[PDB]
Amino acid sequence: HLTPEEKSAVTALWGKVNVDEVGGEALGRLLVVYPWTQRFFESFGDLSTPDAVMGNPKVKAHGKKVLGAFSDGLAHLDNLKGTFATLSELHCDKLHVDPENFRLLGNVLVCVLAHHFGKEFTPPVQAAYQKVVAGVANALAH
Amino acid sequence: HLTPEEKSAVTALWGKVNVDEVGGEALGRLLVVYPWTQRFFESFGDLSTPDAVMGNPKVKAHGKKVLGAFSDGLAHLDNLKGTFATLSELHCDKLHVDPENFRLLGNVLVCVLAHHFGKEFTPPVQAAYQKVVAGVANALAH
Amino acid sequence: VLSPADKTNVKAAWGKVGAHAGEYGAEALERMFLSFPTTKTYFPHFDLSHGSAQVKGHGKKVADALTNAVAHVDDMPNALSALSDLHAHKLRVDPVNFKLLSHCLLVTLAAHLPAEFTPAVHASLDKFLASVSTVLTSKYR
Amino acid sequence: VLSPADKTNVKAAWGKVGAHAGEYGAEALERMFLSFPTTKTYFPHFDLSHGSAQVKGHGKKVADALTNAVAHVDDMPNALSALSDLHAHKLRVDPVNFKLLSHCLLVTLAAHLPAEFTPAVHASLDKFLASVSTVLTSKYR
Numbered sequence: 094h095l096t097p098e099e100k101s102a103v104t105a106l107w108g109k110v111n112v113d114e115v116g117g118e119a120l121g122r123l124l125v126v127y128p129w130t131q132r133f134f135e136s137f138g139d140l141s142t143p144d145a146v147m148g149n150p151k152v153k154a155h156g157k158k159v160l161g162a163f164s165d166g167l168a169h170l171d172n173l174k175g176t177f178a179t180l181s182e183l184h185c186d187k188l189h190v191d192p193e194n195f196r197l198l199g200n201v202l203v204c205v206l207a208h209h210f211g212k213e214f215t216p217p218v219q220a221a222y223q224k225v226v227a228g229v230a231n232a233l234a235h
Numbered sequence: 236h237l238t239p240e241e242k243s244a245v246t247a248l249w250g251k252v253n254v255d256e257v258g259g260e261a262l263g264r265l266l267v268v269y270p271w272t273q274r275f276f277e278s279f280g281d282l283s284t285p286d287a288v289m290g291n292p293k294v295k296a297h298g299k300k301v302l303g304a305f306s307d308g309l310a311h312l313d314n315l316k317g318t319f320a321t322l323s324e325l326h327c328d329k330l331h332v333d334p335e336n337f338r339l340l341g342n343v344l345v346c347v348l349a350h351h352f353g354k355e356f357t358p359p360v361q362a363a364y365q366k367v368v369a370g371v372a373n374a375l376a377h
Numbered sequence: 378v379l380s381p382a383d384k385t386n387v388k389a390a391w392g393k394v395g396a397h398a399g400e401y402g403a404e405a406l407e408r409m410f411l412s413f414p415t416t417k418t419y420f421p422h423f424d425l426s427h428g429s430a431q432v433k434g435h436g437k438k439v440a441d442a443l444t445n446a447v448a449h450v451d452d453m454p455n456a457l458s459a460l461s462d463l464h465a466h467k468l469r470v471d472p473v474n475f476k477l478l479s480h481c482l483l484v485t486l487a488a489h490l491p492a493e494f495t496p497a498v499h500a501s502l503d504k505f506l507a508s509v510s511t512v513l514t515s516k517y518r
Numbered sequence: 519v520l521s522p523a524d525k526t527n528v529k530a531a532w533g534k535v536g537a538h539a540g541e542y543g544a545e546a547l548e549r550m551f552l553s554f555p556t557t558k559t560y561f562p563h564f565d566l567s568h569g570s571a572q573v574k575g576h577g578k579k580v581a582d583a584l585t586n587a588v589a590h591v592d593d594m595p596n597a598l599s600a601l602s603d604l605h606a607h608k609l610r611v612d613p614v615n616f617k618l619l620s621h622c623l624l625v626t627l628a629a630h631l632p633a634e635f636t637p638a639v640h641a642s643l644d645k646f647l648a649s650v651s652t653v654l655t656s657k658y659r
């Protein structure tokens with residue numbers, strides 16, 4: 094439920110996001126901050142330390158595919174459920190990811206954006222991204 | 236997603252539930268076990284002790300209207316969202332009840348049923364009521 | 378944080394469990410596997426059929442751990458450090474699952490010890506199990 | 519349960535907050551009211567407009583309480599007992615709301631102290647705020 098001004102705020106800032114590094118950082122921080130999420134990535138190698146996770150090449154590669162999907166939901170912000178119907182199915186029937194973890198990843202992404210943008214990540218900018226990440230968390234919950 | 240045998244199990248047991256006492260008990264135990272839920276019932280008088288809550292006449296009366304609604308969802312188990320559309324609106328726009336509290340009340344009801352039925356509340360009976368209370372919690376979340 | 382009355386309540390209630398404690402652990406494990414089938418993914422090499430003897434054995438160990446946590450309720454992080462090593466570091470059990478086994482234990486006690494499962498004891502037991510769950514899912518070693 | 523490294527991390531990070539701490543409390547309160555408007559129902563008689571002086575004052579008090587909790591991180595239930603009396607007994611603040619203010623504080627620190635907000639500090643700060651929240655929502659008096 095974004096206003097036309099919230100849609101514009103969110104788009105202006107996504108323009109300036111490094112799409113090679115932010116997804117990895119977000120996924121990296123999820124594995125370090127909520128350590129049980131690593132059980133879902135046992136095929137990714139060494140996740141034993143924060144620096145092992147943050148330098149892991151498979152975490153960075155996978156984080157790019159996650160941020161691709163957030164980018165895709167920002168383009169189809171009025172029809173999120175559909176956009177994420179195929180993906181809601183992988184997380185549930187094939188992977189069983191409890192839906193509270195989807196909200197945890199959205200909140201880690203909002204903090205990574207705050208970390209990169211500083212003063213630009215104003216309270217009005219954050220309030221609009223909170224709407225976007227809640228939308229995506231709700232469309233992935235099957 | 237109840238099997239025909241789970242539908243029958245759940246109906247057999249609801250038959251033998253006291254509809255004057257179980258709702259009050261469930262609502263009573265919610266206010267005692269999760270003490271912040273009492274902020275929503277400040278107009279109900281004395282909630283200061285467990286025994287004050289459990290004897291409060293307005294808690295018992297209100298618990299009857301809650302169990303009425305569970306009874307109504309058991310009759311329309313295939314169309315829960317609709318059954319609870321008007322009620323999802325009171326809890327959200329007029330009352331703002333965070334949806335985690337809906338799941339807390341369903342789990343307190345399952346424990347009150349266990350307390351009254353003992354050995355009859357078998358693991359197969361509980362597994363079917365867990366489906367029913369999850370359904371009702373999901374149809375009240377707006 | 379448990380109150381002093383919460384601690385009295387837990388000690389008295391669990392003390393009434395007595396020698397039925399392993400039996401109640403196994404029932405709680407059986408209720409959690411039936412009601413919430415996703416929890417079976419943590420036990421891939423277990424027979425999880427009704428009356429299974431591996432569930433009876435695991436039920437007894439979970440009950441024993443809870444008796445130990447009741448005896449050391451004032452110093453649970455020290456008392457439960459080996460189990461926190463297993464659940465949080467080795468198994469990486471998701472905390473949502475600790476809410477599901479706590480519910481199945483409360484249902485097991487309500488069904489077997491009704492006269493003890495008063496509203497005040499229910500509230501104290503719910504606080505104790507949430508506190509045990511927090512230690513088991515934390516890495517503080 | 520905080521590890522010994524978690525405790526070192528929190529002390530060093532919050533120590534870098536310094537005299538900006540009330541300023542960061544007020545920003546976190548402003549981010550929580552804008553992002554999650556249901557939290558305004560706890561402050562009915564407050565001016566909650568941008569630059570409000572009552573939010574600046576309340577931001578300073580919340581920061582001071584967190585400095586005190588950092589100084590007494592080993593004995594937080596004793597250090598925070600008056601605040602637990604207010605939040606859990608008088609106000610009956612729902613625990614969901616403590617997750618929302620903790621997020622808004624983390625966002626405030628990430629935006630102002632990037633070089634300190636490493637993945638390890640983020641993890642330690644998240645554990646510390648969850649531990650403060652548990653005391654404030656518990657009735658253990």
Ligand code: HEM
Pocket residue numbers: 130133134155158159162163180183184188190194195196198199229230233
């Ligand atoms: C909340 C937003 C999230 C989005 C947008 C997202 C998106 C994606 C995408 C695009 C893929 C790849 C699908 C494919 O390759 O066909 C994927 C895979 C996966 N996701 Fe997520 N995901 C999210 C949250 C989570 C969470 C919370 C977890 C676990 C805690 C998780 C675990 C996985 C796993 C295990 C895979 C399979 C990756 C593999 O096989 O290597 N995801 N997700």
Ligand code: HEM
Pocket residue numbers: 272275276297300301304305322325326330332336337338340341371372375
């Ligand atoms: C989860 C199942 C629940 C059901 C089936 C349920 C059902 C109902 C019903 C039937 C009413 C009365 C509506 C009317 O009188 O028109 C009601 C009112 C209300 N419910 Fe619930 N409810 C549930 C959960 C909750 C929870 C979790 C809370 C708060 C923690 C809550 C707080 C209230 C309040 C404040 C009212 C208004 C009562 C009054 O004004 O005195 N309910 N609910």
Ligand code: HEM
Pocket residue numbers: 416419420438439442443460463464468470474475478509510513
């Ligand atoms: C009240 C909470 C819990 C307690 C007290 C508890 C206690 C125990 C104990 C005593 C053991 C065995 C220790 C040993 O033999 O060395 C154990 C092992 C285990 N627990 Fe838990 N547990 C709890 C919750 C859970 C939950 C929620 C899950 C997952 C859904 C789980 C999964 C396991 C698994 C997979 C093992 C290892 C089993 C094996 O392969 O032998 N536990 N737990």
Ligand code: HEM
Pocket residue numbers: 557560561579580583584601604605609611615616619650651654
């Ligand atoms: C990190 C967590 C929190 C800390 C450290 C904290 C700290 C404080 C402190 C220091 C006070 C004032 C004490 C006094 O003047 O006597 C206070 C009051 C208050 N807090 Fe919190 N708080 C936290 C979370 C919350 C949350 C989540 C809410 C609600 C959404 C909330 C609502 C209030 C309210 C309504 C007051 C009373 C305000 C008044 O009328 O003066 N607090 N808190």
